[PDB]
Amino acid sequence: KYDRHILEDYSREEFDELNAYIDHERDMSFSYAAVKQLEGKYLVQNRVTRQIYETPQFLYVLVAMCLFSKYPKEARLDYVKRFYDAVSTFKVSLPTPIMSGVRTPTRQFSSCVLIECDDSLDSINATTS
Amino acid sequence: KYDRHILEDYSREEFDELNAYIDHERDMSFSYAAVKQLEGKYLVQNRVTRQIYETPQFLYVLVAMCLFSKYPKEARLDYVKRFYDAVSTFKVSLPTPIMSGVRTPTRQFSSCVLIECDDSLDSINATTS
Ligand SMILES: Nc1ncnc2c1ncn2[C@H]1C[C@H](O)[C@@H](COP(=O)(O)OP(=O)(O)OP(=O)(O)O)O1
Ligand SMILES: Nc1ncnc2c1ncn2[C@H]1C[C@H](O)[C@@H](COP(=O)(O)OP(=O)(O)OP(=O)(O)O)O1
Ligand SMILES: [Mg+2]
Ligand SMILES: [Mg+2]
Secondary structure (H helix, E strand, O other), X not given: OOOOOOOOOOOHHHHHHHHOOOOHHHHOOOOHHHHHHHHHHOOOEOOOOOOEOOOOOHHHHHHHHHOXXXXXXXXXXXXXXXXXXXXXXXXXXXXXXXHOOOOOOXXXXXXXXXXXXXXXXXHHHHXXX | OOOOXXXXXXXXXXXXXXXXXXXXXXXXXXXXXXXXXXXXXXXXXXXXXOOEOOOOOHHHHHHHHHOOOOOOOOOHHHHHHHHHHHHHOOOOOOOHHHHOOOOOOOOOOOOOOOOOOOOOHHHHHHHHO
């Protein structure tokens, strides 16, 4: 379900050090209109079994850790905390294309694309493909 | 309407020699069910103006001359007469793909094609194109 590079991109020692920053007590601040769509389609789960394999608390820190892979190993640990505190306190909002597709093997994160076709059969076949 | 290679593929001298073999007196042997579809869609004509630019007599000799371009210039003149006598006496029949598309710039003469698509998105896009 995840991408096989996160564990190979960080250290086990600092992992537990950063782990003691995400007490799940803040998870009890949602609304029904939130958890509804969340369980519907926002997090990783098999679309045929619906066996959810994640938790709305590890979501934010997981995406914040994955987005900061290629960085110097001197400030990323103290830098991910700011983004986590921003996303957890609902100060910054993120779409489905970025929360429905993060840390996922299929690396696609755009939201809109444009295309125009002129008078040519080959162009029409190409834009159809 | 024609292809700009026939005149560059034969000689003007033998042209008139082969010309005295196609007295149009045999053109008065059709049926209404023939000329109907012929004027409908069998010979070269603009599909928006319907200004016909051919004649059902020059059709056979034109296609027989065009089909015999790449040949030694020693027997083609005496060889095209056999095919013309075959097609004019209705002994051999020819489809629209070969009579609707001969001596035409768009050189396409097949009649059927096959294609199969397996389980792949790229394959589907390719076969659609
Ligand atoms: N088989 C067809 N017959 C008539 N029009 C077609 C056909 N296929 C596609 N078209 C439409 C869409 C094409 O953009 C347009 C023809 O342009 P094109 O694809 O460049 O072929 P073409 O060069 O033979 O015609 P044109 O000279 O008008 O551009 O007409
Ligand atoms: N976006 C899609 N989601 C689900 N199925 C799709 C999708 N697009 C096409 N399909 C259908 C047609 C494809 O042949 C088939 C998936 O096979 P494929 O094109 O090879 O992609 P894939 O490798 O990611 O899936 P699979 O491993 O099952 O082959 O499912
Ligand atoms: Mg064109
Ligand atoms: Mg596949």
